[PDB]
């Protein structure tokens, strides 16, 4: 049954292996004859599946790598906390948050870079930060620096503990294979233990520490006069004065009359007027409910006892109209190969990150976060980029599994075979829908441009000539506006202010949130989003499905997952491996994410953000020209790229010069990438031949003969440089513009 | 003087630029308290700017019409230190590096597998070779005269 199984000292810690490189693979271990050897030593460093074949060693290596990664993350967190404690102006920002810019980095005075120490405010000079850490610390209840120092020390200690644990589990006591394959216990502990207890404990902290300190802060008291958090725990009088319910203690909870706790566990919803964030009582209530739900749901699978459920029984016994026998051999597939689990987890994490970004810009969960425009922009863009990258990687790992871990003899699955047997219909229909969507979505813009250039503004697809309104979205907005009165009797207001109707919420003369209207431009942009998403899905799905074999190459599995081509014959067979399909899909993911972030930035700068006056009128940043100027490509090039780049390029001689320097550097790297993307290997090898002759003429030729990069390495270098250049350009442009004008 | 240029200790645009920079710094200096650390930093910056301008004036450079110094790589005797004096120095150092590297390669050509010595450097032999480059011109000239510089 379920038990702990370990092996004692599988490997011995010794420096002998460090002396010689490439010990994992024999062909690497032989010795270097050409430079290519070096480039291989890094390519197969983490290819644990190809070093050996036993599952036990792979699992142990995976565990140790996870521990190392956790240690690195803890070290990074400790460094951030120590920087916040030592070189920062947190205490100044605490008293006057609206007129002080956060900053936690100070530049030395070595060469002339001291001009980077801009005057953020509050008697401090330093680089303004846009990580949103200050809002997190304020919402946590931290009001000093000693607490931050203690947190940093604890983080360092935790990093050391994680490193020791990784070493101990790889070199002293290594879990056996049967320990890993016990997924029922893993799921039970991950649901009930990690997600339930953690959120319950955080709810306890929020109820006991964050709520009273934040109440005192919002009441207008000076930060240096607020009582320390432990005084609230020790003294019941202070809590009773702040909340009378605590005077009754824990008696009501055991008596099931929970309404007595309605003082600090509410259901109002909406945004708090003082700070423009969600009510902390609602957040604590939500955390408590989530804890209860997760603790309940973590006791579903049978482990070592009579009660519970079996995953294999659930999968096998499920009979449906469309599936049939269906899920039969999926349990072995998902418990035998690591790559399938990696693919599913990567897809789920990417989707979760994107949803996180959307929900976080929609409803600000931290105090004084909505009015900080740079923080919002940075958080949204960063999280969406991360989600896109993870979603892309999922397909690559699925292709790896399909290539090297799929055999129909020992493990057979009906649904997978049924999907494989009719791939042509899937690909054909996906291709047709992609063509149709792209044709319509881009033809609308081209038609708008052409009718504009000919002096025919009455034949456009616009808000005045021919209208295409998103009626369904408007209906949903109206239903959500009307919901709190009838559909949600408990909720006092709307879940978020984004839905049409309601009132503007502004903090300190700056607009925090107001309803976002939808028109023709939103229709067109959403259809463009759908088109790009569909094309990326088509590329990745084709790469995954046609990995094992194709009509052109009937034996593509033998060649492997990473092979440049098959030869000049058959008319040319370049880029048929699934790796090349991933390399092609990266560009389209980049395109889609760039378009989406551009849309979000322009819409927010045009129709939401701005300034409010004493009289009551609202003046937006760009004057609300998105509704009429974004229906043509000329409008996107002139009113958005040309107009908003003034702050980036005219930042020389000021405290934002680094942004312009990075703006130029990203352009240089993007132009550099085309050198690898466009050319071929033979020319470079033939040039290196003459260079090597010139070297040998002077008796300075090396023993490791130079060799041009392989084809796959060239493509990888090209795509890496391209992505880095584009992302850095967008980063510099966004940050400079939103810091200057926001 | 040369090519219609003005000496840098006589031009006016130099002084105007210096005044502009000093005023720009002093505008930010006023914001903080006079005794605070940012005030000390800004005072240090002002002192550095003044010293740099005085040194540039005293070094005998030539500002142009718009007010910036111009370098002369022509070969005039009044600008020995503008291009020619540094450049020779560079060559010396550069030659050093090259010479040292070449020597090390030969020092590992005898063994059967020099690749192991290329990817994993040894420190003793490299340290022996490093200081032989201090006299690289003499050894290079002697080798060129002897004829051992070029393979056959």
């Amino acid at each position: 049954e379920v038990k702990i199984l370990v092996d004692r000292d599988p490997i011995k810690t010794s420096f002998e292996e460090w002396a010689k490189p490439g010990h994992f693979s024999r062909t690497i271990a032989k010795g270097p004859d050409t430079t290519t050897w070096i480039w291989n030593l890094h390519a197969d460093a983490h290819d644990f599946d190809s070093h050996t074949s036993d599952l036990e060693e792979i699992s142990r290596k995976v565990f140790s790598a996870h521990f190392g990664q956790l240690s690195i993350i803890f070290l990074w967190l400790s460094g951030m906390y120590f920087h916040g404690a030592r070189f920062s102006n947190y205490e100044a920002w605490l008293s006057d948050p609206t007129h002080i810019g956060p900053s936690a980095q100070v530049v030395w005075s070595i060469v002339g870079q001291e001009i980077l120490n801009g005057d953020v405010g509050g008697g401090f000079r330093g680089i303004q930060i846009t990580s949103g850490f200050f809002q997190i610390w304020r919402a946590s209840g931290i009001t000093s620096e000693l607490q931050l120092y203690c947190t940093a020390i604890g983080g360092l200690v935790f990093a050391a503990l994680m490193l020791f644990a990784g070493w101990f589990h790889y070199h002293k006591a290594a879990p056996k294979l049967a320990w890993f394959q016990d997924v029922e216990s893993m799921l039970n502990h991950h649901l009930a233990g990690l997600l339930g207890l953690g959120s319950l404990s955080w709810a306890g902290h929020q109820v006991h520490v964050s709520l009273p300190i934040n109440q005192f802060l919002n009441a207008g008291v000076d930060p240096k006069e607020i009582p320390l958090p432990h005084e609230f725990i020790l003294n019941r009088d202070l809590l009773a004065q702040l909340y009378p319910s605590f005077a009754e203690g824990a008696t009501p909870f055991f008596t099931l009359n929970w309404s007595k706790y309605a003082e600090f566990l509410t259901f109002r919803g909406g945004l708090d007027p003082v700070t423009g964030g969600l009510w902390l009582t609602d957040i604590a209530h939500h955390h408590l409910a989530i804890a209860i739900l997760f603790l309940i749901a973590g006791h579903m699978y049978r482990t070592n006892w009579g009660i519970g459920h079996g995953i294999k029984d659930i999968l096998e016994a499920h009979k449906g109209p469309f599936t049939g026998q269906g899920h039969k051999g999926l349990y072995e597939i998902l418990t035998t190969s690591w790559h399938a689990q990696l693919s599913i987890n990567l897809a789920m994490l990417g989707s979760l990150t994107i949803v996180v970004a959307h929900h976080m810009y929609s409803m600000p969960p931290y105090p004084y976060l909505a009015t900080d425009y740079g923080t919002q922009l940075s958080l949204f863009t960063h999280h969406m980029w991360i989600g896109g990258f993870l979603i892309v990687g999922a397909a690559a790992h699925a292709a790896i599994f399909m290539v090297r871990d799929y055999d129909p003899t020992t493990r057979y699955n009906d649904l997978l075979d049924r999907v494989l047997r009719h791939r042509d219909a899937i690909i054909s229909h996906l291709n047709w829908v992609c063509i149709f969507l792209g044709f319509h979505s881009f033809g609308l813009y081209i038609h708008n441009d052409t009718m504009s250039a000919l002096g025919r503004p009455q034949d456009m697809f616009s808000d005045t000539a021919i209208q295409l309104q998103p009626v369904f979205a408007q209906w949903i907005q109206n239903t959500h506006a009307l919901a709190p009165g009838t559909t949600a009797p408990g909720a006092t207001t709307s879940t978020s202010l984004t839905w049409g109707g309601g009132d503007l919420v502004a903090v300190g003369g700056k607009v925090a949130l107001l309803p976002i209207p939808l028109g023709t431009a939103d229709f067109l942009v959403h259809h463009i989003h759908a088109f790009t998403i569909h094309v990326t899905v088509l590329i990745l799905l084709k790469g995954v499905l046609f990995a094992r074999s194709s009509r052109l190459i009937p034996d593509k599995a033998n060649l492997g997952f990473r092979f440049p081509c098959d030869g000049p014959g058959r008319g040319g067979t370049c880029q048929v491996s699934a790796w090349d399909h991933v390399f092609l899909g990266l560009f389209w993911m980049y395109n889609a994410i760039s378009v989406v972030i551009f849309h979000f930035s322009w819409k927010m700068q045009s129709d939401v953000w701005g300034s409010i006056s004493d009289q009551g009128v609202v003046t937006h940043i760009t004057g609300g020209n998105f509704a009429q100027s974004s229906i043509t490509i000329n409008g996107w090039l002139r009113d958005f790229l040309w107009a908003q780049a003034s702050q980036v390029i005219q930042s020389y001689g000021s405290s934002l010069s680094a942004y312009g320097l990075f703006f130029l550097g990203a352009h240089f790297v993007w132009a550099f990438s085309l050198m690898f993307l466009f050319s071929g290997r033979g020319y470079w090898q033939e040039l290196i031949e003459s260079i090597v002759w010139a070297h040998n003429k002077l008796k300075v030729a090396p023993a490791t003969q130079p060799r041009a990069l392989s084809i796959v390495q060239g493509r990888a270098v090209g795509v890496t440089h391209y992505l880095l250049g584009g992302i850095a350009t967008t980063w510099a442009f966004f940050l400079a513009r939103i810091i200057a004008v926001g | 003087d040369i090519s219609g240029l003005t000496p840098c200790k006589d031009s006016k645009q130099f002084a105007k630029r210096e005044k502009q920079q000093i005023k720009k710094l002093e505008s930010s200096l006023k914001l903080y308290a006079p005794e605070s650390a940012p005030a000390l930093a800004l005072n240090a910056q002002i002192e550095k700017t003044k010293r740099r301008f005085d040194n540039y004036g005293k070094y005998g450079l030539l500002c142009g019409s718009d007010g910036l110094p111009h370098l002369i790589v022509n070969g005039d005797q009044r600008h020995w230190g503008e291009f020619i004096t540094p450049g020779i120095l560079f060559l010396y150092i550069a030659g050093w590096i090259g010479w040292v590297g070449r020597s090390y390669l030969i020092a590992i050509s005898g063994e059967k597998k020099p690749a192991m010595k290329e990817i994993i450097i040894d420190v003793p032999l490299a340290s022996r070779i490093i200081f032989r480059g201090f006299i690289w011109p003499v050894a290079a000239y002697r080798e060129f005269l002897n004829g051992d510089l070029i393979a056959k």
């Binding site: 030592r86 070189f87 920062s88 102006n89 205490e91 100044a92 100070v106 530049v107 030395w108 005075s109 120490n117 509050g122 008697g123 401090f124 000079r125 330093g126 | 605070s36 650390a37 940012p38 000390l40 930093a41 240090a44």
Partner: peptide, 11 residues
């Protein structure tokens, strides 16, 4: 806040 900035310019 001044001391934190001065920590960089101690030398």
């Amino acid at each position: 806040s001044g001391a934190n900035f001065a920590r960089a310019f101690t030398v």
